Symmetry: D2
Subunit: 32 residues, 4 copies
Amino acid sequence: LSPDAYRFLTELDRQLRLLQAQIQRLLEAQSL
Amino acid sequence: LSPDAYRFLTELDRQLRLLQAQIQRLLEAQSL
Amino acid sequence: LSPDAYRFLTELDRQLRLLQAQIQRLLEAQSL
Amino acid sequence: LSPDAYRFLTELDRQLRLLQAQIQRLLEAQSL
Ligand SMILES: [Cl-]
Ligand SMILES: [Cl-]
Ligand SMILES: [Cl-]
Ligand SMILES: [Cl-]
Ligand SMILES: [Cl-]
Ligand SMILES: [Cl-]
Ligand SMILES: [Cl-]
Ligand SMILES: [Cl-]
Ligand SMILES: [Cl-]
Ligand SMILES: [Cl-]
Ligand SMILES: [Cl-]
Ligand SMILES: [Cl-]
Ligand code: NA
Ligand code: NA
């Protein structure tokens, strides 16, 4: 990867991780 | 959450986890 | 959907749309 | 972008577009 692509992917990864974490918390919070 | 919403979010979560993992592997694979 | 689930999904959608747009712009910007 | 990065991002984009579309359909399907 180019530096620029690396940087971009790093920022994408951080955002996706945050979203995934929000979904995971919501699922975990469910009374079954 | 409704069952339907729970199910939907579960499947979304699984897909996002797979994508995040692909990005993480690509980043990790970079010679600095 | 519950109001809460609707609200959550709305915010998720907005974030994903922003990410997708960033990727699309990067791809479009490529000299082939 | 490298060819490899371009290819990767293309596939990521396709997957995200599919997910976003699923969320959008669910939201649109809601009786208010
Ligand atoms: Cl550079
Ligand atoms: Cl550059
Ligand atoms: Cl950047
Ligand atoms: Cl049901
Ligand atoms: Cl139902
Ligand atoms: Cl489903
Ligand atoms: Cl409420
Ligand atoms: Cl509530
Ligand atoms: Cl919220
Ligand atoms: Cl190559
Ligand atoms: Cl290569
Ligand atoms: Cl590939
Ligand atoms: Na719900
Ligand atoms: Na690159």
